[PDB]
Amino acid sequence: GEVRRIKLYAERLADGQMGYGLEKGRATIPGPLIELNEGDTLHIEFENTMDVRASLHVHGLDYEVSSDGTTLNKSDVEPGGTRTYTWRTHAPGRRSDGTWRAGSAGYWHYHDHVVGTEHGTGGIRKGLYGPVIVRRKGDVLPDATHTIVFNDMLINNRPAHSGPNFEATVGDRVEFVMITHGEYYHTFHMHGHRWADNRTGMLTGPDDPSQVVDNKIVGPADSFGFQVIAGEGVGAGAWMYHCHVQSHSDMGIVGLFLVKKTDGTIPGYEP
Amino acid sequence: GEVRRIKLYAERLADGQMGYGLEKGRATIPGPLIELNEGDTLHIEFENTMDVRASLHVHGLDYEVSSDGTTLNKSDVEPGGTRTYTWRTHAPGRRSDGTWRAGSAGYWHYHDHVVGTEHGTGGIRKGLYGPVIVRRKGDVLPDATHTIVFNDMLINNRPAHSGPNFEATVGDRVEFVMITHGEYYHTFHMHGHRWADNRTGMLTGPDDPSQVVDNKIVGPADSFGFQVIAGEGVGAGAWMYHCHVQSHSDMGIVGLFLVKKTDGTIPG
Amino acid sequence: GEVRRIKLYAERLADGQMGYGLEKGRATIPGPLIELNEGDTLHIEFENTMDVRASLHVHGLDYEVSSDGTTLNKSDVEPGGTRTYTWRTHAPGRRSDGTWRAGSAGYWHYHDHVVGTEHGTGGIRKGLYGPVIVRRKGDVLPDATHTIVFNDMLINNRPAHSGPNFEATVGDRVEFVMITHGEYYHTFHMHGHRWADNRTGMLTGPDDPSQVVDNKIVGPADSFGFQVIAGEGVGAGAWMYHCHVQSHSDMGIVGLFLVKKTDGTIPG
């Protein structure tokens, strides 16, 4: 597959936060979505603009120790410093010993490994996390992708212990990337929608026995994803997603999946 | 593909509890088991007999925002109010985008979404929860179904952290619905028995790679279920089920799968 | 299968620990690895050398109530006593009614059920746990097996919260058995390697939709395992494994999978 390159910056934002961005002064929490096809190699031209050591570490993908982004493997970045990180991917295939080598495809994530502690406790806390999707040949591609990160008792490090709203139209193929970080377990729930507990979050067919769920227990550095048909069999509406741990939802760990009719309207709701 | 109609009532119960029932004065915790086939529509004539707003919200099934049972969608019920909730279910099928639409089938649950907080924290704590099973055409039906709800540090809101006992005979096909609620994670474990981590809790055949487990980590609003052949390869006995979080078992979060020999006896 | 017999000892160890061993004065935490093929029977002649009641209890495998290792089923062992526990396993196959019977194969574990509490809370905390592997005919066998137990905030009851290092050469087939015990949930993570969320931790082939993961939430009495090709697509190095709950990693719940080049060296 293709050899690609991107630039990534770790920036200190306002309210003491830390973000990854594709451009100087455009950092977000979560970080930009990185999307690769199995076989693709990505060279990340990383610059740490901060006054503290920072790194880039990735789950799931192939990398050498020289791209671990750890102190252990000397692959974190001094303040103002630069480093090229290399992420490789592979397709599934038959090994010489006759076994099936699992591909890179899945819902993954990248995060800092050296801000605050040697495990990135400070960096993760402040917002140095973002989503990676690795696709298999033939995977169904969505109309939109939305990333929801349960980071301690926050969603996407938003204030007032509350999460973002995502808009779609009835019938849209909407993809969710669901990442968890920090100290606590959570349960991710979405009203009016459900997905498969498997690689793609979609049943392959009637010979896929994967449990169909609307609620999933997640812990720190868990990642999964799924695609739904917005409003399928349920209609347009304000469709709550929330942590289902009762004190978490009560704290305001809640967001809206706003599913509009094709005339742009939505049944009346009271946020 | 039948249209069904039931009545459901929310009621205050003894010892500061609340429950759902099919008739006034007959509320239980957990609530009544609702069983549907994929394609069935259920109209629930729900009456809130209580002095606080209350709702019905279901996991997994198809419903419009007018049946959300939330403050957000104004679809909860005033004190002494009545409201018809509609739950729909669908069969799986091939979409016009060539993907496979997951059917409604599975182990699900319903609970209040407005007692105490706008997430039903009070209602759930006090007993407003019950199990829902949606069956696929050709699913294997059990000899009996038993519901185990880990609600905070209780089983089915019973006193003294203790779980109920369920009786079976060796060779019985026994279904468990396992639902978790409240604040805490748990691990559900059963002695002498095991199940598949998949939709039915039963391996479909040799092509089913699902992990076979006797221990499952669960969090609030998780629901799974399974069927076992009682005593299969292990024989009659008092087969403990317990949370496997050590302080949880130690405080009494334990019950018995009492599997009788064909003559009716349990060794011990 | 085959009928196998072993001796097992429960012994007190230095620092108030308790271990199982295959020989007196060779007890380890975790206990010895027990490996069976589906259909095998294992008779364990268990001697409790300690001054308190102790038991042997197994997850996943077939056993009668007389081998429960519980007070409930009067199958624990008096101080200094001996008891023969029997574990059976079965291959999968169709029942007479056409349903698929799952099979014993999996990553399992054995532990004490009577030290400290009637759920073995003290036995487990002190180190009375070990791994069981039940293999299916045609299962891929590894070059080595390493056991990692998250016991409360310890790995394998080691002091100062640290984990063991495990050594391999690039290309080795390395099996990990991952068991959790005690009070807390955890997330197991390995740098530079990944596995399938299914029975074997390896995809059956291109029809297996199991999620591929490098991070798994686990709770008390959870067992899973997997095999990796050491350094596959990533090369030689010090490959960290760690609990991913940030306070757990920060307090030292970390270890190294040391993958050497064929020439015996590792990158700095």
Ligand SMILES: [Cu+2]
């Ligand atoms: Cu790490």
Ligand SMILES: [Cu+2]
């Ligand atoms: Cu939460």
Ligand SMILES: [Cu+2]
């Ligand atoms: Cu990580």
Ligand SMILES: [Cu+2]
């Ligand atoms: Cu809700």
Ligand SMILES: [Cu+2]
């Ligand atoms: Cu529990």
Ligand SMILES: [Cu+2]
């Ligand atoms: Cu809910």
Ligand SMILES: [Cu+2]
């Ligand atoms: Cu037990």
Ligand SMILES: [Cu+2]
């Ligand atoms: Cu941990």
Ligand SMILES: [Cu+2]
């Ligand atoms: Cu146990």
